[PDB]
Design a binder for this molecule. Structure first.
Ligand SMILES: N[C@@]1(C(=O)O)CC2(CC2)[C@H]2[C@H](C(=O)O)[C@H]21
Ligand SMILES: N[C@@]1(C(=O)O)CC2(CC2)[C@H]2[C@H](C(=O)O)[C@H]21
Lengths: 438, 440
């Protein structure tokens, strides 16, 4: 219903879960604030810096055609029909965020040779190039995440664990990979529970007692969506049930997962893909205003939900995102590098196909998608923009078009509670014991 | 590359694995005779009789747009694009065969509200109408088949078994459903192996070796693709490894799965969905020759493969199917049943939308798929066409567009060479098997 359009010489398709998935009947629920709106603004911020970059396509302005997935694969696939209908013209696609939506969207995109780079889809399956030949990502596959989690249990001598998976490609294949890896380290799994898309608080108590039916297994491994980890922790709190949580990037270092069930979560070890905040995105997001951000068609709806106001009611104007603490979303960097990977690919494309000018020559009217994905997108290699220069971070894709298997490890501890970085994984597990009380 | 097109007032899409899958450079392999050609020819047969029928769509003609899936989802989806290029116009789609083919095709077909009826896709994944709101099938979900297979093990007190599943939505869900039914009947799994999309003869051996790592687990439960079962039977014969096979409809009673691996498979228990060879299909298929069947662009290739001749070298001419021992592929009836399910739904929709004529009126141009599926496809009830005398079977779909969980159980034995399938029993809301018919 709402289209996000930016004019430009070339148009970059975008796909973001602006809204949450709806209730039993509605396809779209409330605005997904952090992983939705903020990740969308990250693509818009990147496109602005690129359009100001004199070293990166100074003669070709990049546009955007950003669609909302509503956190549901079938809705994203109904929306992704815009990207194919013409064949405005869509050069590539940034997104989606959730694996299921990327799989579904990739199967349609390959039929029209549309390149796609995801900034958050981690499911290992997307690494298979015979089925997903137009798919690249700035994120590593979950082969490497599940391997890393198996080493955490191997290190802390945890050999009788349990597993919790969100239904879908991410949770199932993620736990499946974890099965192989725990097996390979003498770790035996007591039981394996699966969480339905939209369970009730009664259903999660079912899962708690299901995990409890083996009291000896006090450790639980999770390949879960954040809502699921939060409802399961809430259910654990209500049922006065104490588990040792070992969780994937779904939970990550999200305050919203543990908020209200901080006691039930204390002791937990979580994983986030290795990222850093970008300060120029921070000041850009906090200076965003509903009367100046008309280019984002969902920014007013976010503003009404963020501040409990209405533009009809005239009570939105006194608020600012600067009064608020800015908790920059974890995968913001990966959105930023994914837009840059596509822009560099196209800069390299233009350099070779239009040597005589900075403008778009007939050799890129239209842009050959196959040549773009195979010869340029896959062969990008540049410094991550805005990177913490003290550490050398580089943007490229391996033989399977995946990002680098590097993860940060955290712990939820204690009045007051907080996630603390305790280690990392980058080919090997590396963590210091001095940062854990147990 | 080829597309079987025929004129009609309404056009029904078709999807069959006319060709097996190829290698890395090719997307299409040799001709698939049984699950390809006979299945394609069954739809043409049904179309031909529907168009002669004075009681079923007398004034409305049915055309077709039959595509080749090449036993591969990505190729099928490239092809299925034809069905949605109107936005010739496609009213409904008959197909595909492979469950991963039918899933991919449905995700697209629902976008343009096009009803889909599969004659072979058994994945339980396809029973969920939130996700597959325009899909229906003349076959049951694998929820019942997995229940059927654990009942067979529980009956023979095989408490320690191994599993093998073809990667994808048929193998993985089938076996997972099976393993839960096995657990609940105290049947423990020793090991579980996966058969990938691009398997090598060495990789197939690695699967056999993994199965032998548990020497007590002599039972091997498979939810595999046809080709995946044959190659596992080939790898086991190469290794003189002996397993009791219990296998899903993928294997079924296919002679092509056991060819060259007759001793490796002896004593195998195989499942097929309960069906009957249909009456007039044998006359039709056997009366097919290459100088009349120009309407099937893959038929000449089937002819060459069948008789090991060449039209370019003119050896083929002196041949006819009316001398061969006609083996009617087990799902022929479900293909014919799907074609007739769509025909009846449209006949009934036409009664509702065009009451003053036999011809396709404007209230039905184009056919509204949402109304066709929900108000007419899901509600169809009719006597199964071409049903043999002693049979009184009815074609219908349940609340979730599913067929009924009915299956025949067979066993593979050496009688007089001369190896064959023998029906030992059936499954229909409980197990019934004749222990007297199994040699072992
Ligand atoms: N890595 C994810 C995926 O779907 O592939 C798992 C997740 C569901 C929890 C979403 C995370 C995110 O948006 O930060 C993606
Ligand atoms: N029932 C099937 C399915 O895909 O759901 C299993 C199979 C893969 C082996 C193919 C069989 C067939 O075409 O008769 C279908």
């Amino acid at each position: 219903k709402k289209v996000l359009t930016l004019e430009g010489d070339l148009v970059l398709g975008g796909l973001f879960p602006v809204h949450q998935k709806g209730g039993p009947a509605e396809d779209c629920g409330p605005v997904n604030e952090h992983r939705g709106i903020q990740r969308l603004e990250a693509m818009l911020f990147a496109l602005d810096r690129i359009n100001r970059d004199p070293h990166l396509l100074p003669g070709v302005r990049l546009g955007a055609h950003i669609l909302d997935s509503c956190s549901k694969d079938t809705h994203a696939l109904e929306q992704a029909l815009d990207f194919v209908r013409a064949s405005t013209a869509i050069t590539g696609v940034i997104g989606g965020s959730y694996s299921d939506v990327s799989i579904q969207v990739a199967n349609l995109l390959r039929l029209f040779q549309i390149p796609q780079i995801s900034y958050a889809s981690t499911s290992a399956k997307l690494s298979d190039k015979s089925r997903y030949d137009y798919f690249a990502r700035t994120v590593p596959p979950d082969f490497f995440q599940a391997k890393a989690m198996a080493e955490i249990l191997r290190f802390f001598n945890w050999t009788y664990v349990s597993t919790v998976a969100s239904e879908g490609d991410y949770g199932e294949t993620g736990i499946e990979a974890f099965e192989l890896e725990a097996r390979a380290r003498n770790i035996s799994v007591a039981t394996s529970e699966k969480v339905g898309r939209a369970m009730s608080r009664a259903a999660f108590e079912g899962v708690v007692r299901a995990l409890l039916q083996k009291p000896s297994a006090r450790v639980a491994v999770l390949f879960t969506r954040s809502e699921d980890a939060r409802e399961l922790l809430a259910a654990s709190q209500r049922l006065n049930a104490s588990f040792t949580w070992v969780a994937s990037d779904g939970w990550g270092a999200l305050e919203e997962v543990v908020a209200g069930s901080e006691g039930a979560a204390e002791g937990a070890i979580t994983i986030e893909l290795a990222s850093y905040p970008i300060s120029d995105f921070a000041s850009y997001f906090q200076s965003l205003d509903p009367w100046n951000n008309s280019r984002n068609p969902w920014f007013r709806e976010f503003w009404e939900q963020r501040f409990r106001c209405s533009f009809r009611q005239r009570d939105c104007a006194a608020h600012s995102l600067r009064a608020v603490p800015f908790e920059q979303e974890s995968k913001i960097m990966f959105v930023v590098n994914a837009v840059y990977a596509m822009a560099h690919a196209l800069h390299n494309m233009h350099r070779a196909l239009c040597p005589n000018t900075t403008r778009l020559c007939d050799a890129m009217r239209p842009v050959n998608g196959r040549r773009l994905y195979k010869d340029f997108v896959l062969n990008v290699k540049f410094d991550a923009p805005f990177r913490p220069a003290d550490t050398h971070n580089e943007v490229r894709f391996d033989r399977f078009g995946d990002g680098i298997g590097r993860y940060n490890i955290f712990t939820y501890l204690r009045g007051r509670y907080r996630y603390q970085k305790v280690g990392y994984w980058a080919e090997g597990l590396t963590l210091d014991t001095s940062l854990i009380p147990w």
